Amino acid sequence: PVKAKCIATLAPEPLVEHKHRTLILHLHPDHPTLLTTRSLGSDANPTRQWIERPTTVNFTVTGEGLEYTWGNHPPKRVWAQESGE
Amino acid sequence: YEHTAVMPNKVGIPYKALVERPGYAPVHLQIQLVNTRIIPSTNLEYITCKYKTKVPSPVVKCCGATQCTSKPHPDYQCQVFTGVYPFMWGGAYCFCDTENTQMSEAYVERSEECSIDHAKAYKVHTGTVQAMVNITYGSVSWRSADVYVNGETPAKIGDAKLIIGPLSSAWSPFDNKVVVYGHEVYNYDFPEYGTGKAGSFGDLQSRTSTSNDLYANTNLKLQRPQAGIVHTPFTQAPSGFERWKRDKGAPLNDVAPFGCSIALEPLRAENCAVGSIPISIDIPDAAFTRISETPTVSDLECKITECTYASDFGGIATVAYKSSKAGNCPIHSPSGVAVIKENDVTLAESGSFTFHFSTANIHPAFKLQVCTSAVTCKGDCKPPKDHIVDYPAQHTESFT
Amino acid sequence: YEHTAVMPNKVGIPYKALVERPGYAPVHLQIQLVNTRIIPSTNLEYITCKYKTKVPSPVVKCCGATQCTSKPHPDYQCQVFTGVYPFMWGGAYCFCDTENTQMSEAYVERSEECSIDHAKAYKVHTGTVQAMVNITYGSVSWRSADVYVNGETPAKIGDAKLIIGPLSSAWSPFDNKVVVYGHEVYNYDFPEYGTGKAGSFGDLQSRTSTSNDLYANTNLKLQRPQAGIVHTPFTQAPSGFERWKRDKGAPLNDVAPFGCSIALEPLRAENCAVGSIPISIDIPDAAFTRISETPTVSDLECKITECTYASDFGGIATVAYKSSKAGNCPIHSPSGVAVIKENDVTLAESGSFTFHFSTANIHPAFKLQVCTSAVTCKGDCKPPKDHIVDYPAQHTESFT
């Protein structure tokens, strides 16, 4: 057994949607995709869920940031400061 | 002029402080902590992996017993058995019918995947954090050097000597006990070398890959082969490395706090944005410009024109520059309210040049130090609309 | 029957507890913590050693200057000098008289002794203590196994499974910061890598022996050679490794508390007698003798005959054994007042056999459990005369 880099997986890109300190994400994979995040406060408040059924989800993003992992697609990151004026 | 500065630990954004040396012209900083890779002190305690019941081929004495001995193989399970009639290619071959004896033996051994696909425990201490700090300094305009955090280490790469930390935010996102797998790192209370219950994680526990000795609590129990046929019932828990790959927990690069990323590399935890770092630099005095050569800018005026109450450098402000000479003029807001994109502004003889910035207070009353000339750029700002992209440049939220 | 037992940490003496399993015959222990080697968690911070001013041979330009540059050698001291007339084997050789230039350069380098004769700093954490515990168990009569202290580790060497500690006496005799030298270990607040003042300890500070980089604050100051002759005045502090060998402090194996010895070996601190260890064993049930096979000894009598109020097993006591069968009978005083040399006594049909012991109370009222038969061996003891030899077997001093 060797450390080959398999030609490997990739899940379709997400639909990013803005709200006030909140990411609505209409999402639509090919296969069951383990999504997960890390609210970068010292309060981690992570989430995990395999997604195979297309699902609009939500994420209470904080002031300092959140990150977002659409499958083995690379991890995203997001500034959600205010939007409530 | 050894410019001490408390400094927030946050990776992807410069920290353009200002050198207020009494006597010569000030110089801006641009300190971008491009990385916060950690590399705690650790110890390889034991690799684990899934077993392989690589059965040695059983003995079959045809008429009478064959006592087994406890060979020193890891988890060497061996049990004599009688009452067989072993069908092997010619029907049976041993002519007795109860004195037909069969001695099954099986030991546990590292898989071939153990070398390569293997979890890996650690006792993790704190160690010492690092960074490839870029400073596009002053007029030097470049140094991208790897540094430490311990508050007496310089790194004379470029021309400047810089001392960092120790940081106050000692949260090692790694716990004391950690399991590691390929790239997914698990802050797991692995039981220990030498103990792991069969089926549970660490049923196989080898010190390293080379280590011929190990601990194999697999509950390997041989049973007698059936109805006078040659084979080896090995009844065994599939590994706690088999599970731990599909009934596991989530990775620390997906559950950590305070903003870290991970690698199976020196076991760093990159970019952990938390707390502050007391950083202090000894600039090369040659890089200074004497005060009598930069234009004096006073008798000026500053005002916002479209302040954006935001993260991206949306805040702007014209400045009625009132110079004496003409040239460059480093700039900074000594108040942390306003973070400015421009370190330096060019000046003709008393012109005007807008800069960009970002704030967090509706009424930004921040001083601006245009190369030894302070000014309040008071005003009012507007909220944006479009907030779903990576991390800010503002990082200055307070009471507003 | 998993015989939990709090147990004093003290090295060179057995601890002959007694297994009171309800149902079968009891069995004695003999737990001798032959070693208490510690091996804390540590980090090699920097080797130091005495420098060697391995001068590179100076330049001598005969008519005009030779500007020096700051080469990256450790503590690369270099200073141009003029005004020479260098006598070299033919009188002088450079025909000028003031334009004769001499550029002296000297850097610091690890001695050849640095590889071998070298102090060695450490940041020392707590780690995990060990022992080669002999138990000449029961009738097993032997196992000499290396164990741990962490209170879930077994070590199935022999036949018994034994769990030790964690000890309550967390005094690491090592301090946080330690210097180490050959065998003499110094719990010294070494200044740090990268900082050590010249002359003071750690004037040379190399990470390891291989490490070409280092920190050499030696205050190496070159002076001009005298009266037109070739040589290199290097004015320098002899090392803080030179001192630290004759104005040092004393070694931790000569100044530690609570009874430790030391080695430049895994950095253990052997035999640290302090506090107690909550030890618990799972005996092999096969080693038990069932209760209906050992003689019942009751209707007996015990009395001292010459009790020695002492450390060596000077206390003795006949016992009017009143047996049923004839054979062996393990013995122990469940009270810690009396420590007994004999684990087991042979018995004919209701004979008498003296044993040896040691106590600390003038009136030793200690129970004696002769294989499920208790008895008070009350009496009175005598002080000895001859107290200058190694350590006791009594270790039971209390209010008397």
- Angstrom distances, CA of residue B139 to CA of A25, B242, B357: 45, 58, 21
Residue of chain A whose Cα is closest to the Cα of B308: A85
CB–CB of B255 and A46 under 8 A?
yes
Q: Within an 8 Å CB–CB cutoff, is residue A40 touching chain B?
A: yes
Secondary structure of chain C in HEC code, one letter for each residue? CCEEEEEECCCCCCCCCEECCCCECCEECCEECCCCCCCCCCCEEEEECCEECCCCCCEEECCCCCCCCCCCCCCCEEEEEECCCCECCCCCCCCCCCCCEEEEEECCEECCHHHCCCEEEEECCCCCCCECCEECCCCCCCCECCECCCCCCCCCCCCCEEECCCCCCCCCCCCCEEEEECCEEECCCCCCCCCCCCCCCCCEEECCCCCCCEEECCCCEECCCCCCECCCCEECCCCCCCCCCCCCCCCHHHHCCCCCEECCCCCCEECCCCCEEEEEEECCHHHCCEHHHCCCCCCCEEEEEEEECCCCCCEEEEEECCCCCCEEEECCCCCCCCEECCCEEEECCCCECCEEEECCCCCCCCECCCCCCCCECCCCEECCCCCCCCCCCCCCCCCC
Largest CA distance in chain A: 57
B328 backbone dihedrals φ, ψ, rounded to 5°? -85, 160
Q: Within an 8 Å CB–CB cutoff, is residue B152 touching chain C?
A: yes
Handedness of CA B391, B393, B395, B397 (dihedral sign): negative
Q: Within an 8 Å CB–CB cutoff, is residue C152 touching chain B?
A: yes
Residue B72: how many other CB atoms lie within 10 Å: 8
- Angstrom distances, CA of residue C192 to CA of B180, B195, B328: 32, 40, 42
Tell me the structure's resolution in angstroms, rounded to a single decimal: 5.2
Residues A75, A46: Cα–Cα separation, whole Å: 14
DSSP C159-216: S-EEE----S----SS-SEEEEETTEEE------TTTPPTTSS-SEEESSSS-S-EEE
What's the burial of B137, exposed, middle or buried (CB within 10 Å: 0-12/13-18/19+)? buried
CB–CB of A81 and B394 under 8 A?
yes
Q: Which of C43, C152, C195 sits opposite B152 (nearest CB)?
A: C195
Total residue length of chain B: 400
The size of the A-B interface in CB pairs under 8 A is 91
Q: Within an 8 Å CB–CB cutoff, is residue B153 touching chain C?
A: yes
Task: Report the candidate in C49, C108, C53 with the shortest Cα–Cα distance to residue C241.
Answer: C49
CB–CB of B387 and A21 under 8 A?
yes
Q: Are B198 and B77 in contact (CB under 8 A)?
A: no
Residues A38, A67: Cα–Cα separation, whole Å: 6
CB–CB of A79 and B390 under 8 A?
yes
Residues C29, C369: Cα–Cα separation, whole Å: 13
**Encoded tokens for B50:** 């899934």
H or E element at residue B162: strand B161-163
- The bridge status of strand C339-340 relative to strand C355-358 is antiparallel
DSSP letter assigned to residue B157: S
Q: Which of A1, A37, A40 sits opposite B113 (nearest CB)?
A: A1
Q: What is the gyration radius of the CA atoms in chain A, in angstroms? A: 14
Q: Within an 8 Å CB–CB cutoff, is residue B176 touching chain C?
A: no
Residues of B in contact with A69 (CB under 8 A): 254
Residues of C in contact with B43 (CB under 8 A): 41
CB–CB of C152 and B192 under 8 A?
yes
Interface of B with A (CB under 8 A): 112-113, 115-117, 171, 250, 253-259, 261, 273-274, 309-312, 383-392, 394-395, 397
Residues C43, B206: Cα–Cα separation, whole Å: 24
Q: Within an 8 Å CB–CB cutoff, is residue A48 touching chain B?
A: yes
Residues C214, C207: Cα–Cα separation, whole Å: 7
Neighbours of chain C (3+ CB pairs under 8 A): B
B110 backbone dihedrals φ, ψ, rounded to 5°? -55, 135
Q: Within an 8 Å CB–CB cutoff, is residue B298 touching chain C?
A: no
Residues B25, B290: Cα–Cα separation, whole Å: 5
Residue of chain B whose Cα is closest to the Cα of C163: B195
DSSP B212-251: S-EEE----EE-PPSTTB----EE-PPPTTTTTSSS----
DSSP letter assigned to residue B147: B
CB–CB of B192 and C154 under 8 A?
no
B255 backbone dihedrals φ, ψ, rounded to 5°? -135, 0
Residues B117, C280: Cα–Cα separation, whole Å: 37
Residues of C in contact with B154 (CB under 8 A): 194
Q: A78 to chain B nearest CA, in Å?
A: 4
Handedness of CA B227, B229, B232, B236 (dihedral sign): negative
Q: A63 to chain B nearest CA, in Å?
A: 9
CB–CB of A40 and B259 under 8 A?
yes
Q: Which of B265, B390, B391, B395 to mutate to test the interface with A (most CBs of A within 10 A)?
A: B391
Residue B54: how many other CB atoms lie within 10 Å: 12
**Encoded tokens for C376:** 């008070």
